[PDB]
Amino acid sequence: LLRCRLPGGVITTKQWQAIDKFAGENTIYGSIRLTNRQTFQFHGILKKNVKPVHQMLHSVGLDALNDMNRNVLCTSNPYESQLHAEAYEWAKKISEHLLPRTEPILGQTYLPRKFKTTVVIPPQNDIDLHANDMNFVAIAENGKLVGFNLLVGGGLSIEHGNKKTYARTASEFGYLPLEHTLAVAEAVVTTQRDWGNRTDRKNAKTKYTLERVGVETFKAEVERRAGIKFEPIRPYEFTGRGDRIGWVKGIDDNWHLTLFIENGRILDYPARPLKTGLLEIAKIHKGDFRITANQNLIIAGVPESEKAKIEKIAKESGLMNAVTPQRENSMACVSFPTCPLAMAEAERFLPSFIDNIDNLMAKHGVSDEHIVMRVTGCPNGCGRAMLAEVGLVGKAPGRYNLHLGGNRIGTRIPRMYKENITEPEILASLDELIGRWAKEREAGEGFGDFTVRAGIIRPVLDPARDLWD
Ligand code: SRM
Numbered sequence: 001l002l003r004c005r006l007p008g009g010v011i012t013t014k015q016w017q018a019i020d021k022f023a024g025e026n027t028i029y030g031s032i033r034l035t036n037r038q039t040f041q042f043h044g045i046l047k048k049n050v051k052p053v054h055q056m057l058h059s060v061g062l063d064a065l066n067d068m069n070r071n072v073l074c075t076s077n078p079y080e081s082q083l084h085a086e087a088y089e090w091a092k093k094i095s096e097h098l099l100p101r102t103e104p105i106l107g108q109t110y111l112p113r114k115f116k117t118t119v120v121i122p123p124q125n126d127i128d129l130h131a132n133d134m135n136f137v138a139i140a141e142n143g144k145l146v147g148f149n150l151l152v153g154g155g156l157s158i159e160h161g162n163k164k165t166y167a168r169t170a171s172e173f174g175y176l177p178l179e180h181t182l183a184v185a186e187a188v189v190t191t192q193r194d195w196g197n198r199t200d201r202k203n204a205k206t207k208y209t210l211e212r213v214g215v216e217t218f219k220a221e222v223e224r225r226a227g228i229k230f231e232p233i234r235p236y237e238f239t240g241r242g243d244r245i246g247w248v249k250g251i252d253d254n255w256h257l258t259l260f261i262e263n264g265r266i267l268d269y270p271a272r273p274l275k276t277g278l279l280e281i282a283k284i285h286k287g288d289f290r291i292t293a294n295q296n297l298i299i300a301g302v303p304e305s306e307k308a309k310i311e312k313i314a315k316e317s318g319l320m321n322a323v324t325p326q327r328e329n330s331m332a333c334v335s336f337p338t339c340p341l342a343m344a345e346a347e348r349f350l351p352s353f354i355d356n357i358d359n360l361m362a363k364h365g366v367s368d369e370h371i372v373m374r375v376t377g378c379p380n381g382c383g384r385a386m387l388a389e390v391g392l393v394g395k396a397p398g399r400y401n402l403h404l405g406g407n408r409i410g411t412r413i414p415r416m417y418k419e420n421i422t423e424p425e426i427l428a429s430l431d432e433l434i435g436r437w438a439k440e441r442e443a444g445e446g447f448g449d450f451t452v453r454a455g456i457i458r459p460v461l462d463p464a465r466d467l468w469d
Pocket residue numbers: 001003034035036037038039040041043070071113114116128131154155156157158205295332333334335338339340341380381382383384
């Protein structure tokens with residue numbers, strides 16, 4: 001397995017052509033796997049190719065640079081298209097500022113655990129901020145960014161039956177002018193580095209450090225170290241976490257074509273040459289591609305005149321095959337056969353599972369609707385099921401824990417509803433549950449909120465204390 005450092009998921013067509021080639025020739029699987037952290041992975045690199053892979057990444061200006069700072073995410077397709085550039089420039093700066101000097105920031109012993117950061121452009125939460133340690137929520141005025149609201153402490157990983165572990169959402173620290181960004185970023189990393197419990201790795205994460213010392217205590221140290229005082233949180237709202245599948249207008253005569261790629265797995269399948277179609281678009285595309293946090297790919301900045309050009313290839317290659325709004329809002333992790341920590345299938349199970357969910361949605365007359373549904377192959381939480389309305393957490397081969405209760409924007413953790421059950425048992429529950437939502441839901445009420453309001457599942461109000469029954 002090889003993964004790239006790709007801030008904000010922006011990758012050029014030239015770099016793309018380089019990855020399509022290597023993946024095709026130098027890997028067992030021969031596929032490109034877009035991750036939900038806006039980057040790519042190769043699966044099955046032969047040890048002889050471990051050298052040419054780094055060279056290949058480098059020749060195109062890429063790198064794979066662990067208990068370090070992971071890919072810094074950034075909202076991929078904002079409604080106010082102009083805001084992307086400075087947000088993306090900031091995600092890129094934070095990423096570079098947090099890189100190891102090989103360690104004034106990381107420390108010699110580095111970090112207790114992996115540190116995850118994001119730049120969010122409301123009203124979109126496609127990057128799923130509550131799954132991350134440090135979050136920069138962009139505040140704009142007159143089309144220019146002016147500062148960031150800082151949310152710290154997100155994390156989703158749990159351990160089966162271990163009430164000492166839990167998923168936690170990020171806490172609000174305050175508003176910081178744009179100039180204090182790197183200082184604040186640096187301060188959060190260092191206090192976590194110092195305060196973070198290093199002995200027990202399962203308790204090293206920031207979400208744990210925050211619960212032990214307290215948000216306000218953590219906050220004061222961040223202000224002390226940063227040389228600033230946080231200002232009050234400035235109003236921000238989210239409306240969803242999905243991608244804008246299809247064409248959307250960008251700035252000027254620019255357009256963006258977000259392609260839905262199931263499981264982010266790019267490979268040529270019989271009659272659906274996804275991998276070649278993307279190579280073909282890469283060769284004629286004026287611009288970049290953007291890897292979304294929903295494992296999809298955006299063909300960004302297509303001049304209005306080139307729309308038909310690109311659409312012809314995407315269409316012919318099966319890259320624009322129509323899916324239901326449900327499939328578009330469902331996610332799973334890689335899991336088998338490559339993940340060594342896998343307990344239950346995820347990526348290889350999602351497709352057929354969703355076929356089943358689509359039938360249920362149809363059967364209840366809600367086929368134009370969607371439920372944020374995610375399947376994670378083990379509790380480490382890579383598929384982000386702990387921020388979904390319906391989350392399936394793998395417990396053993398063919399058995400998952402069923403969580404319900406999250407919401408569409410992902411600001412609530414789903415409590416466990418049923419435990420260690422199989423697919424036919426999972427579907428029987430959802431058949432009934434969807435049946436009720438379809439008939440009892442209020443105007444525009446999501447499935448998650450319904451289960452909570454209808455007394456179907458108690459909400460998780462304070463993860464550290466009431467996540468576990
Ligand atoms: C590809 C991806 C899932 C996907 O289908 O997209 C992935 C895949 C794996 N993750 Fe992850 N993680 C991915 C996002 C995350 C997320 C979600 C997120 O960040 O948005 C989480 C949950 C949030 C969180 O971090 O709390 C996540 C929590 C973990 C953990 C639990 C860590 C912890 O703090 O307890 C592990 C295992 C570990 O680190 O000990 C892990 C471990 C793994 C490894 C690398 C397995 C391993 O340790 O050997 C998996 C690779 C399997 C494979 O063959 O691909 N992965 N993983 C994501 C790649 C991210 C990236 O490109 O940087």
